[PDB]
RNA sequence: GACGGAGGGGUACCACCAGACGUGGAGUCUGCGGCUCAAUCUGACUCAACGCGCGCACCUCACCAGGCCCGGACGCGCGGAGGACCGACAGCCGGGCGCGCUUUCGCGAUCGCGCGGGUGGUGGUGCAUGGCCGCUCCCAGCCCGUGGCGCGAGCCGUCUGCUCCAUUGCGACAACGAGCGAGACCCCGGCCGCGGGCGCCGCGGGACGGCCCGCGGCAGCGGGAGGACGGCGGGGCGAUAGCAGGUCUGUGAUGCCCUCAGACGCCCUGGGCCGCACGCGCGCUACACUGGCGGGGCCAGCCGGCGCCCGCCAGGACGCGCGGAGCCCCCGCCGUGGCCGGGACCGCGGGCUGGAACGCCCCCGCGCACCAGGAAUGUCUUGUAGGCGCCCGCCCCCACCGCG
């Protein structure tokens, strides 16, 4: 079985859903020899936009925030394997699953 | 730098026994103690050695208070990232005096022996809370605003 | 520390936030009369599946399903999706009176025929007061009647319109139907206190010794 | 280690004596004119400046050692700010050209053997400037 | 000093007399875990519980002390 | 025709990305939305007040 | 105006395929892809944004096509009595049916 | 209700006091006012306008000087296909654009008209009005049911006691129960634990006015110790009611009203907002001696890539994906000299990038004012003031600005 590696990277808005993604591939994964979760520093996308749509007032402004987190887990099965995986995981619409060959 | 895994990163094998965490003003010093032979050395750089040659007198304070016997015979290895230059200092100073306490270990008073450090400077063993604030909008900076015009 | 900070995905996943703003506003064009409420698109396997949340599925299929993957294909022009590998979910909603964009929907296309601006609101407020909604905003504005704001707010419960959990139990509806005179704006509040998934934080349940 | 041990003011001011009987490196004159940096003020008097900077890089080289340092790198050791502007000064580097003949010069003595990313000591290099410490502490 | 609503002193209020129980008079710790049975209150965040959690130590204290 | 100078100009010509306005493109991230146009669509991008 | 009569009927049978058109609006020169056609030299050419939507709001000022506006968008959807008028000047048949006719039925 | 050079209490470095750094005085810059111009596009104008509407060489762009171009949809009435439209080498006019000429060439109803209608428009009215925001508002009040009191306007609870930033409570009360604000909640730290992990990062817990002593009807209230931290961490979200506050100049938010093809439509070309006594509204750098200027030990936290080679740099080539501030601290050089203080104005070059400098940086002149700032002003109590740097927003170019 001609075993690659494969890097599994999840970017998502919500830690609430992020960890119930998360959960699944390690759940799935104790099977396939799946390594641990790697959780990434939050990434700020921080807009800073004066709230007034007009000049008027002393111009206070939106710091609208965005997080992201990333999860990074190895896994090293056949390239099928992780189809198997994929019915089981639950998906939740919109997250990202990233495959790293 | 930054909360990395520098704890122990730079160094492999002789671990070093002890593991005592210094910090002030995000400056980040884990010691390492070996029990050797008077290496007080921390940033891997002697303790005469500093960057203000002045404030060195005050990282010398468990020196002079506590025993010499215990400084007599040590070994240190220290990895100080983050600080302006003085938060690195003091960071240090509550890293060591930490992993002097960490030596003691066994005798149960230990802390007895340690609270005539804190008598004589308090936060040797208790980091401080004191944190940068920050701007908000109108202001140059964390408390102030554009000077106003008109009351 | 060894990773590009040019990782391309991470901008790649905002893109498909700004695909759900131009899918909200793409349903909002004419599928909010249709019926659309909520949506949410899935390209994690280039699948491009799409929940389209809404008070009646069957306005979208009409009589045939023909126009059913055709606003997928107004996406296919745009994105390259092919009919059937995208999908569009438009299932039930239930519980509509707790639904905001259509309910002010429900009550702006009667006043686009016009009826009593006040009877028209407070029949709404009912409708998602038996859904146990205390406090309905019916918050009108605009030129109202007489040129000037002519502002009327109709409110039947304790809604809170301030503090993080506020959106929690709240939602807001901008809907303007537009007199020969012009603009009369309506934005609308709910009341969801009995959240069943989270707890809101007044709420005290309390207990009795036996 | 006692490199670490030297002072760095002692180790740099100290080991150049020597290098001038060496006559290693051989600073050039056209550098020997112009003014280091594209933000100092005005020249630096010291006269043997080329001289006393080949006794400032290969110090900090010996910390360096294995990751390397380019061109960029030892100019960073000695960056400085514009002293003299009616609206405020943002940070800039210093003059690329008399940096690229102290480490480039450095190649040549052997001292420094390098083939990675920027700039590495050859080991020989390492022992001696290391050796020049040696004598420095005791 | 720190003064709480009526909603906060009456759930305490509540707690420490129509289910007294035990709560404790004059120790916090007890009480730190005695107001967390889920039926006794239901209430999110643990500083918000140790709002009930600060009074009621006064309010069985006072009903040591003599009767409220 | 008018196509000889018709549009010729070559420079940026960015607009917002929701609206058809020129100014405020904020191509901070990519995102070429408008600033006033950000206003109402920042939730659904994901970005919060917090 | 000189709108080819290639780029016309090539142009009507696109939208009349997908029963759909999603263009960001363009002001001036632009090239729509998806619809491609054979010019006179027997090229393969795109047609232009500028023309593309004179004869875009002339199908749905006709009635011919329903379309909506997102801003900066031209969103098609195709009726019925469109497809007869499509077929009226394609000079193609009517048993011929738009691709998306029937088949997106989800279980 | 609102006022009050009315009283009785509250409270806020937007109030003040003990102080601090200021600003106004100096130069410089940016935005106004007021001028000038073909044109200086404009909105705002006490807090609550005036480095603000997210970085004008062009575009933006609203304005000025010049011209091209239709994009007058859909229905009928026409004109009418070898005749509707539309392109054109030279010789031009004309920056120019086959625009329109001389020209002699190509097209092929794809359409031109007449109408009725669509047609855009940073064009007017924000005292048509949506949305959103400024303020009232370092600021707590709001109203409902039932019952009372009043012919009624209205009262009562919602309070002439105490406490709290706060109807915040605790007591007491023709009111009695509810609520919405404030709280709660959420965001980041003070610390630790569990799973883990590359990127130390996700999930829990934890300081509770808990306890001590004094007072407290009691709520609370000081003095306290343990303790990561003392009784909100640094933030957001913020009631009822308003304002003829601001924006039609962000918009598929738009009413009325205008310009609808010699256009207020839409493209190009050159302008202008970078003009401009004095006056201002923020800023910035200075006046040196805790300062310079000095090489040369350095140090971050936002969260960020480097190498090599020529070139003083500016930069340019050739590439590989990879990495950090200033002040200060060093020893020195240096007399109180508008100084080797300061860095203006401005000759001479080197470049950058851009269709294009009128943008900018570096090198080398040059050494403006200014030697401690009059009235009159602000803004703030710990990681705070100040001092000193980094990053972003916009942007080919360019920060003194703002968010951090």
Known sequence: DMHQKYTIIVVGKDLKLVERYVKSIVKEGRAFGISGPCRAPVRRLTITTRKSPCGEGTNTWHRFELRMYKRTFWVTCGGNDISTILSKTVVIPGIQVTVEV | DLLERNDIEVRERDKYTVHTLGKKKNSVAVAFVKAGKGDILVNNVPLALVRPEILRTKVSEPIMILGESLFKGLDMNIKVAGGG??????????????????????????????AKLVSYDRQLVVSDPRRCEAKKFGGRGARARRQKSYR | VRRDEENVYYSKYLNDCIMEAELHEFFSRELV?????????????????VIIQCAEPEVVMGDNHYRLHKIEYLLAGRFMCDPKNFNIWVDKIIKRGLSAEIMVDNLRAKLEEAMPIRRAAYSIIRTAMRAGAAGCEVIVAGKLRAQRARANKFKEGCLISTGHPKRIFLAEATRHIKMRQGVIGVKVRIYNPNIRGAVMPDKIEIGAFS | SSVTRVPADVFINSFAAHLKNRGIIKCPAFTDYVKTGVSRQYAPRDADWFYIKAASVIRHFYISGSHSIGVAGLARKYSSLQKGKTTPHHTKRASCKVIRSIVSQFLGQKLLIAGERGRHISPNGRKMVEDFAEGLQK | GKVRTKTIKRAARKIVENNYESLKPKDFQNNKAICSKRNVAIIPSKRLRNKVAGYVTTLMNRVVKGPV | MRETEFCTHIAHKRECRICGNYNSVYRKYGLFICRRCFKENAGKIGFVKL | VHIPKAVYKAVYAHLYENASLALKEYWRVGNVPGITYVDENGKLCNPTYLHVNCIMQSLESRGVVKDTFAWRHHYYLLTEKGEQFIRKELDLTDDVLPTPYSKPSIK
């Not at chain 2, 003085?86 to 230990?110: C, M, N, T």
């Not at chain 3, 009369?33 to 599946?49: E, H, K, M, N, V």
């Open chain 3, 33 to 49: 009369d249709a019926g659309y409420a909520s949506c949410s698109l899935c390209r994690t396997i280039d699948s491009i599946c």
């Open chain 2, 85 to 114: 230059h003085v938060s690195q200092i003091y960071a240090v100073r509550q890293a060591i005096s930490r992993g002097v306490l960490a030596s003691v270990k066994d005798e149960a008073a230990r802390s007895e022996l340690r």
